[PDB]
Amino acid sequence: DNLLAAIWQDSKGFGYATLDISSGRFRLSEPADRETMAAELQRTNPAELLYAEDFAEMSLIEGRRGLRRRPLWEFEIDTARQQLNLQFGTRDLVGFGVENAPRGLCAAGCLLQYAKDTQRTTLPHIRSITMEREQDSIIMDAATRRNLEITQNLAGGAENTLASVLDCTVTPMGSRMLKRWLHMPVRDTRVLLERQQTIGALQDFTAGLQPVLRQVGDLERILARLALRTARPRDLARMRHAFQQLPELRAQLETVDSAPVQALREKMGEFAELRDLLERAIIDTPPVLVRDGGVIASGYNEELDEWRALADGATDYLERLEVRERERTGLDTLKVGFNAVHGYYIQISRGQSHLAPINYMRRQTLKNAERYIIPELKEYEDKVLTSKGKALALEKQLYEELFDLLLPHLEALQQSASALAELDVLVNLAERAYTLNYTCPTFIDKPGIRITEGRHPVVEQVLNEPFIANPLNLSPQRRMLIITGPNMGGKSTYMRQTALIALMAYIGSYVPAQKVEIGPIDRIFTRVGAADDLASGRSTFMVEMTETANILHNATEYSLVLMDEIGRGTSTYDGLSLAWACAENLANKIKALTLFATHYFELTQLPEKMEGVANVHLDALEHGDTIAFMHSVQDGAASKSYGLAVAALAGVPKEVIKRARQKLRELES
Amino acid sequence: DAHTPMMQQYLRLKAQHPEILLFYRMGDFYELFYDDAKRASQLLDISLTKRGASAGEPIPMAGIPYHAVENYLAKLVNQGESVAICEQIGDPATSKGPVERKVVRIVTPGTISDEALLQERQDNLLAAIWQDSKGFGYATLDISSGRFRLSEPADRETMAAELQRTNPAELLYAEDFAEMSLIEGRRGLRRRPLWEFEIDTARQQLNLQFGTRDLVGFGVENAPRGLCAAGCLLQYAKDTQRTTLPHIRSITMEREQDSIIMDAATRRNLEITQNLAGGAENTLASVLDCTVTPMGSRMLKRWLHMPVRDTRVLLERQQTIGALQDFTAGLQPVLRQVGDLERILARLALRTARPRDLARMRHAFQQLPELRAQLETVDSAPVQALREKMGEFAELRDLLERAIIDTPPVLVRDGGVIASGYNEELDEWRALADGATDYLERLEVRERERTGLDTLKVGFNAVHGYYIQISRGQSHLAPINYMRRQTLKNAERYIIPELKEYEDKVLTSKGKALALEKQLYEELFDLLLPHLEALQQSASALAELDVLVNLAERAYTLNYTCPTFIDKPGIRITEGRHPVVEQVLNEPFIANPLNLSPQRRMLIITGPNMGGKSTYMRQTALIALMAYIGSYVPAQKVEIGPIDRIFTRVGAADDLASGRSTFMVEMTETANILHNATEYSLVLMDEIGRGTSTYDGLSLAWACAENLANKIKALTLFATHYFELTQLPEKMEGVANVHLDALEHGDTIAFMHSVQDGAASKSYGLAVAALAGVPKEVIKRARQKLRELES
DNA sequence: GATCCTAACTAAG
DNA sequence: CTTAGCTTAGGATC
Ligand SMILES: Nc1ncnc2c1ncn2[C@@H]1O[C@H](COP(=O)(O)OP(=O)(O)O)[C@@H](O)[C@H]1O
Ligand SMILES: Nc1ncnc2c1ncn2[C@@H]1O[C@H](COP(=O)(O)OP(=O)(O)O)[C@@H](O)[C@H]1O
């Protein structure tokens, strides 16, 4: 009725745009597949649709109403980015989070040009352009995925990350499954509850299953390499070892009562005929490269054994012929050797070399020993050389026939691998749950997070000092906590453990706290750290404000926002002013479950000034030169940073601290 | 106390040296334990591992090989972290407890900005000198202290300078010393035998005295000429004292030339090779790495991260960059064809080269004569040396051209890799094998006409050998002579005694040909191997040549100019630009003058946000680094005085664990600056006191700057949005205000990007946030609040 | 007195 | 790319 929309196509994917003239909501989508395009067009019900002249799939477009064939110049990549930036008055669209989306921006440029064509009126309604994601998974921007340190810390090391604490998974194919899960938080309650039940039920039988799962091996990538018919023999030997161990895994899982544990038990399968084939057709320990040979176990084919028996018959006949030739010639120095260049030979000392009979013919010649070829030996060596090659060639042919026999079940083996990988993450999540004293979360139907005896998993485990437990109550009635406290007080640790508890709750895992009440959460936003992209023309402040803009644009009521102290990298007064307005918009309008840690103590008045907002104070007491921190979240607002005290513990010289305290006396007066 | 015997010994040795990252020799591998591992891991980029637990949780361990120490040891000391190298002094045999370890050497940051390192009046300095083809080897022993120094100079100037610097009380020279003139001035001159300067006797004599098995820990094992001198000196120490002295327990390196010390934080804050995002793109290296040869790419990235202070080396690069500038376009194409000579030769060294790689070796030797000829025309002392050092290796050119096919397959097992006619035998057996393919067709014709079957086609299966495949229609028509071995739906495969005898010839010829090639492909490595030493020198020279022509091409392309060395603390830049930003951004970079000096030691760079405060601050260092890697700087004129340390502290991020807060790390790293900094050191600071409350941050900043000026006297650029510290210049001498400015014409703000004298009073934050993309609703309330806050 | 895991590279496919 | 090969000590438990 008022949803003027644009569509445009490129070879890789298609681009959709929607402008609400009435609302001023400007939205952007990039749906590559046709089903989503049809669904989104039906969902929107565009009042008028613009359609590129050069669009191939006319069928999708032809059904829609208010159809307009539009020129290609309106769908230009460059003209769109500048036209939108000019209207907004910005230099880049990185703040809106649409800069990276080209196809939608193309559509948006044509729509903005058609917005002028339709109205040409005042356009203050168009200040922003959002990108609506259809994942139905918690959407975490790459900035957050490194700020919370989910899998990668700020230094870039795999150590001191959430994944490190929760990745005791015994199979390397399960390590990848969990790291997939941590970055893709399933938002549907029904799936998380199945994992939660399975984690709780397997908790009894963790110790029994975890050892048997280790023996499976990296089955996922072995199947992928088998699919490309380039598995190599040590990999097929790992497939055999798994099929040996699957029956044990099935039996232990039979005892475990849960319906999904029974489904994974049945989905794992047996594949006993493949167990039989690999056991029959591969030697206990083959080499890693097939071209070398020694891969095919004796019993698989009769013909391999016949030619291998000729080759084995050659190696005994080598010693038997060496003994009979040594006795018949009467030469003790007579020794039989195989040089690849000159084939099999008879090497005698030069002293007895001329005494070797006429049948002996020098193929290889050295001064110290002479290497001869008897005609009987030559007939046998020709037999050895032709058998050696045929055996190697047959080995490769059978090693291909094995692929052909194993290939049909690959579909079910892939399902088996997915199930066994899933099981290892689940029994790993059951082990860490019991080992680290985690609990099961519950899902209330309304956005909010209620934590009792809440702990930051990484810090508490990797610091040899008791973590003081912190209670949290974020709800629709209490949407913001201004966490103001002394430096090293725990204001930023208390802030971050809210979102790591929230994330772990949403990949189906047990959580650090004693009790959790996690409501629905759509996105986890953070502004933490500091950096300057001088090469991409962004000062340290701009990058900070670009990420504050991402939050202020794309945050909803259902979103958890964890802003660190902001307004840093401008003058005192200017930073405080921007921080007050940022927090107000996050509370009075956005209504996001927010923790706003600030060393600025003027913002401690915001709960009195605004509704549905509260203050909390991680406190410390300054006894002597040293400062003692409580590490305890208590209600109220801390008035003092004790920065000059936290600098003395940092190692700043006493001379510098003394003058700074003398200056603080003057500054306060 | 309650730990394992070895970790007990580690902790009591670790207790002696509290902040010193201690290298502990656990058999083959030096490795750091507990916190020192986590210090080692994030600096040296070795993999952190958890070894078996000792009276608690597992021990975090981070290790290196014994012979790669000096490579890593350099990367540690150049980031400021002093290394405590701890050898196995005791025998690992007859040690039921841990092998006894003692801290033989403490390699400091190596700050040698002070002109009088060794005093001129310092006597009882018994010294030794010996010379070979490569250069001189000098040693100095102070017997009274037992303090030992070891130097191996490359040119006469350093030898004369070091002899003058030391002023040895007694000098032991050698029977064969060529440049007698340098040592003629030196007092207590003694002509000494060659056996006292034998390399083998020197290594055991030093090891025996210190009680070690190797000198790799002291970092002198690899250095032969100095060790020869040290052996004669140590032998003459026994001769003079007629005793062994425990004072002389160690041998350090006197010729440790101070690379400008840059902590790992700075090496990523300047983005020398790795930007803050971690990508190879938008780094200094990216701008200066258009080097055509992969062997050269790693050479300049090595150079960028070791900015050497020695003027002699920088001048050789400066001259060669200027001289080759004419023949950039001529040499750069010919250098590309050489290939990665570094990596091919490394494969030749392990005797495990692919034949495709030896074909790339041939291609280089083809192109080397052309390179020498072009370089002959360019007359310069180092360009002629690199021209001669490159070499020809014509006999290897001949061998590879004779013994490798124009384009060989990727493995030798593939076959045909060895060029026919290098050996008579290979072509004779290959000719027998080639005899098969015509014999195939000639019996496919003779059998087709004798049988009279037109559909008859002869084929070879690997499993069933050669066969006679005939359609089922003509399969029953095939004669009795034909014997069906292999049976298919559309065709029957027969066999003839002539095809069992011929196929045996084809399969024994095929194998013999393949076996001979492998043998020859090994004989080639034996013939090429002797010259590897000189080929390695050639590779080092060709790599060096390519960074120099790249730097020469980029110098002319980007209009860079030769820098000047005042040799008095100061920096004097006119028309300088940030190399990365102007190259990687469409808009012309506005050039900026800088005038640091002893009279003007501090500039409080206060300006609007994104005014160019941080680029002007880094631009100083990147110009300074490029000047000390002997490259042409981005400028019109530069007079860079001595710098021992570039400190950078722009922005902070917290681990949020293990006692780290945004504030904790900022104060700890300003602490590093406030203690380690010298009058020679360049300090760069952005708004220290960001991670703490308003009044506490200003107070700490005013004390930090005062100490940096009134005491440390460091060439400092103190960027601050705090405008209270703009008053510091009046209070203390040698501090001045500077203002990167911008003009607000309308709602939008234009940044001038020009360093002008004065102090800007206003930070245009709310305006630079609107251009960042913060919603207008947020900006409007923030401006309304700023009105209230200011009032 | 003995017995597992450990630390940089290499490079074939 | 890329997933497989790459080294002297330690330590206990009688
Ligand atoms: N709840 C807590 N219990 C115990 N220690 C804590 C707690 N919260 C933080 N810490 C400790 O505080 C230090 C980090 O403080 P941090 O919150 O980063 O300071 P700031 O709030 O000023 O940014 C670390 O030693 C960390 O272990
Ligand atoms: N001289 C110049 N000419 C053109 N662009 C410049 C110049 N100096 C800086 N810039 C650009 O403007 C930005 C300067 O911001 P910066 O100096 O980092 O500010 P801040 O000190 O607040 O961090 C950089 O991103 C750079 O791309």
B231 in Cβ contact with B130 (< 8 Å): no
Pick the residue of B272, B656, B762, B787 with the most A CBs within 10 A to test the interface with A by mutation: B656
Structure tokens at A351: 């002293």
The per-residue b/e assignment along A616-652, b for 16 or more CB within 10 angstroms, e otherwise, is bbbbbeeeeeebebbbbbeeebbebbbbbbbbbbbeb
Contact A492 B656 (CB under 8 A): yes
Q: Which of A128, A159, A644 sits opposite B48 (nearest CB)?
A: A159
User: DSSP 3-state assignment of B541?
Assistant: helix
**How many whole angstroms separate alpha carbon B437 and alpha carbon B199?**
62
B63 is in an annotated binding site: no
**How many whole angstroms separate alpha carbon B211 and alpha carbon B91?**
9
Check whether residue B4 has its CB closer than 7 Å to nucleic acid strand D: yes
Rounded to 5°, the CA angle A623-A624-A627 comes to 55
Rounded to 5°, the CA angle B563-B567-B568 comes to 115
Structure tokens at A633: 């979240």
B474: left (phi over 0), alpha (psi -120 to 50) or beta: alpha
Structure tokens at B502: 């011929």
User: What atom in ligand 2 is closest to the CA of residue B581?
Assistant: 27
**How many whole angstroms separate alpha carbon B32 and alpha carbon B37?**
5
**How many whole angstroms separate alpha carbon A617 and alpha carbon A614?**
11
Contact A534 B581 (CB under 8 A): yes
Ligand nearest to the CA of A620: 1
Measure, in angstroms, how far nucleotide D8 C1' is from residue B23 CA: 15
The per-residue b/e assignment along A361-372, b for 16 or more CB within 10 angstroms, e otherwise, is eebbeeeebbbb
Beta strand pairing status for B682-686 and B457-461? unpaired
Closest CA to B171 of B192, B187, B155: B187
How far are the Cα atoms of A272, B334, B545, B550 from residue B327, in angstroms, in the given order? 72, 11, 12, 11
What count of residues does chain B have?
791
Ligand nearest to the CA of A538: 2
Other Cβ atoms closer than 10 A to B533: 9
Rounded to 5°, the CA angle B568-B574-B575 comes to 150
E strand segments, B584-680: 592-596, 602-605, 637-638, 646-650
Check whether residue B346 has its CB closer than 7 Å to nucleic acid strand C: yes
Structure tokens at A500: 């790591």
B613 in Cβ contact with B607 (< 8 Å): yes
A487 is in an annotated binding site: yes
Q: Which residues contact B11 (CB under 8 A, 6 or more apart)?
A: B3
Measure, in angstroms, how far nucleotide D6 C1' is from residue B348 CA: 18
Give the Å distance between the CA of A305 and the centre of ligand 1.
70
DSSP secondary-structure letter at A215?
T
Residue of chain A whose alpha carbon sits nearest to that of B661: A488
DSSP secondary-structure letter at B115?
S
| Three state DSSP letters for A490-517 | CHHHHHHHHHHHHHHHHCCCCECCCEEE
State the method.
Answer: cryo-EM
**How many whole angstroms separate alpha carbon A623 and alpha carbon B625?**
46
Q: What are phi and psi of B657, to 5 degrees?
A: -175, 160
Chain B residues within 8 A of A373 when measuring between CB atoms: none
DSSP secondary-structure letter at B709?
I
B103: left (phi over 0), alpha (psi -120 to 50) or beta: beta
Q: Which of A153, A154, A580 sits opposite B785 (nearest CB)?
A: A580
Q: Which residues contact B103 (CB under 8 A, 6 or more apart)?
A: B13, B16, B17, B22, B84, B85, B86
Q: What are phi and psi of B274, to 5 degrees?
A: -130, 120
Q: What are phi and psi of B259, to 5 degrees?
A: -65, 140
Q: Which of A552, A641, A653 sits opposite B692 (nearest CB)?
A: A641
Positive or negative, the CA dihedral B549, B551, B557, B559 is negative
B113 in Cβ contact with B678 (< 8 Å): yes
Same structural domain for residues B670 and B762? yes
Instruction: Point out the nucleotide closest to B7 (alpha carbon to C1′).
Output: D10
> Distance of alpha carbon A85 from its chain centroid, rounded?
33
What count of residues does chain A have?
669
CATH number at residue A25: 1.10.1420.10
**How many whole angstroms separate alpha carbon B248 and alpha carbon B211?**
11
Beta strand pairing status for A48-52 and A3-9? parallel
**How many whole angstroms separate alpha carbon B370 and alpha carbon B389?**
15
Same structural domain for residues B661 and B717? yes
Q: Is B113 in the pocket of ligand 1 (CB under 6 A)?
A: no
Same structural domain for residues B202 and B99? no
Q: What are phi and psi of A132, to 5 degrees?
A: -80, 115
Amino acid at B340: D
Beta strand pairing status for B465-471 and B491-495? antiparallel
B397 in Cβ contact with B518 (< 8 Å): no
B608 is in an annotated binding site: yes
Q: What is the CB-side half-sphere exposure of residue B616 using CA atoms within 13 A?
A: 32
Place of tokens 């361990």: B61
Amino acid at A407: L
Other Cβ atoms closer than 10 A to A400: 11
**How many whole angstroms separate alpha carbon A449 and alpha carbon A560?**
9
Amino acid at B58: P
Residue A172, classified by CB atoms within 10 Å of its CB into exposed (0-12), middle (13-18) or buried (19+), is middle
**How many whole angstroms separate alpha carbon A141 and alpha carbon A129?**
17
User: DSSP 3-state assignment of A247?
Assistant: helix
Q: What are phi and psi of B470, to 5 degrees?
A: -130, 135
How far are the Cα atoms of A206, A435, A502 from residue A181, in angstroms, in the given order? 20, 21, 14
Residue A242, classified by CB atoms within 10 Å of its CB into exposed (0-12), middle (13-18) or buried (19+), is buried
**How many whole angstroms separate alpha carbon B260 and alpha carbon B110?**
10
Residues 556-595 of B with CB within 7 A of strand C: none
Q: What are phi and psi of B169, to 5 degrees?
A: -60, -40
A14 in Cβ contact with A8 (< 8 Å): yes
A452 in Cβ contact with A444 (< 8 Å): no
Check whether residue B58 has its CB closer than 7 Å to nucleic acid strand D: no
DSSP secondary-structure letter at A149?
T
Q: How far apart are the first and last CA of chain A?
A: 65
Contact B773 A546 (CB under 8 A): yes
Other Cβ atoms closer than 10 A to A396: 16
Structure tokens at B748: 């939008």
Positive or negative, the CA dihedral B34, B38, B44, B47 is positive
E strand segments, A286-355: 335-339, 343-349
Amino acid at A216: V
**How many whole angstroms separate alpha carbon B520 and alpha carbon B515?**
9
B576 in Cβ contact with B560 (< 8 Å): no
Q: DSSP string covering B119-186, please?
A: -SS---EEEEEEE-SS-EEEEEEETTT--EEEE--SSHHHHHHHHHHH--SEEEEETT-S-HHHHHSS
User: DSSP 3-state assignment of B25?
Assistant: strand
A486 is in an annotated binding site: yes
Give the Å distance between the CA of A492 and the centre of ligand 1.
7
DSSP secondary-structure letter at A473?
E
Other Cβ atoms closer than 10 A to A117: 15
Beta strand pairing status for A480-483 and A560-563? unpaired
**How many whole angstroms separate alpha carbon B90 and alpha carbon A369?**
50
Measure, in angstroms, how far nucleotide C11 C1' is from residue B731 CA: 65
Amino acid at B511: G
Nucleotide D4's nearest residue (CA vs C1') is A288
Beta strand pairing status for B602-605 and B592-596? unpaired
**How many whole angstroms separate alpha carbon B379 and alpha carbon B368?**
18
How far are the Cα atoms of A161, A517, B673 from residue A506, in angstroms, in the given order? 18, 12, 45
B32 lies in which domain range?
A: 5-107
Nearest CA to ligand 1 atom 5: A467
Structure tokens at A313: 């018959």
Closest CA to A394 of B464, B466, B458, B500: B464
User: DSSP 3-state assignment of B514?
Assistant: helix
**How many whole angstroms separate alpha carbon A350 and alpha carbon A342?**
18
Alpha helices for B597-714 (secondary structure H): 613-628, 662-676, 694-706
Residue B350, classified by CB atoms within 10 Å of its CB into exposed (0-12), middle (13-18) or buried (19+), is exposed
**How many whole angstroms separate alpha carbon B700 and alpha carbon A601?**
18
DSSP secondary-structure letter at B99?
P
A554 is in an annotated binding site: no
Q: Which residues contact A661 (CB under 8 A, 6 or more apart)?
A: A644, B699
Which secondary-structure segment (H or E) carries A480? Answer: strand A480-483
A371 - beta bridge partners?
Answer: A347, A364
CATH number at residue B756: 3.40.50.300
Q: Which residues contact A160 (CB under 8 A, 6 or more apart)?
A: A149, A153, A458, A462, B655, B657, B658
Check whether residue B355 has its CB closer than 7 Å to nucleic acid strand C: no
User: DSSP 3-state assignment of B692?
Assistant: coil
CATH number at residue B239: 3.30.420.110
Q: Is B763 in the pocket of ligand 2 (CB under 6 A)?
A: no
Q: What are phi and psi of A9, to 5 degrees?
A: -125, 140
Alpha helices for B558-610 (secondary structure H): 579-584
B67 in Cβ contact with B96 (< 8 Å): no
Structure tokens at A264: 């994974």
**How many whole angstroms separate alpha carbon B126 and alpha carbon B281?**
53
Give the Å distance between the CA of B39 and the centre of ligand 1.
21
> Inter-axis angle of helices A102-118 and A77-88, to 10 degrees?
60
Radius of gyration for the alpha carbons in chain B, expressed in angstroms and rounded = 35
Place of tokens 């991409």: A536
Amino acid at A293: G
The per-residue b/e assignment along B739-771, b for 16 or more CB within 10 angstroms, e otherwise, is bbbbeeeeeebebbbebeeebbeebbbbbbbbb
Other Cβ atoms closer than 10 A to B210: 19
User: DSSP 3-state assignment of B405?
Assistant: coil
Alpha helices for B337-465 (secondary structure H): 341-349, 355-377, 381-390, 394-403, 424-451
Ligand nearest to the CA of A631: 1
**How many whole angstroms separate alpha carbon A643 and alpha carbon A37?**
56
Distance from CA of A96 to the nearest CA of B (A): 7
Q: Is B692 in the pocket of ligand 1 (CB under 6 A)?
A: no
Q: How many helices (H) and strands (E) would you count in chain A?
A: 24, 19
Distance from CA of A589 to the nearest CA of B (A): 11
Residue B134, classified by CB atoms within 10 Å of its CB into exposed (0-12), middle (13-18) or buried (19+), is exposed
How far are the Cα atoms of A120, B415, B524, B525 from residue B512, in angstroms, in the given order? 85, 11, 18, 20
Q: What are phi and psi of A28, to 5 degrees?
A: -140, 130
**How many whole angstroms separate alpha carbon B233 and alpha carbon B240?**
10
Q: What strand order describes the sheet that includes B646-650?
A: B646-650, B682-686, B715-719, B602-605, B735-738
Q: Is B610 in the pocket of ligand 2 (CB under 6 A)?
A: yes
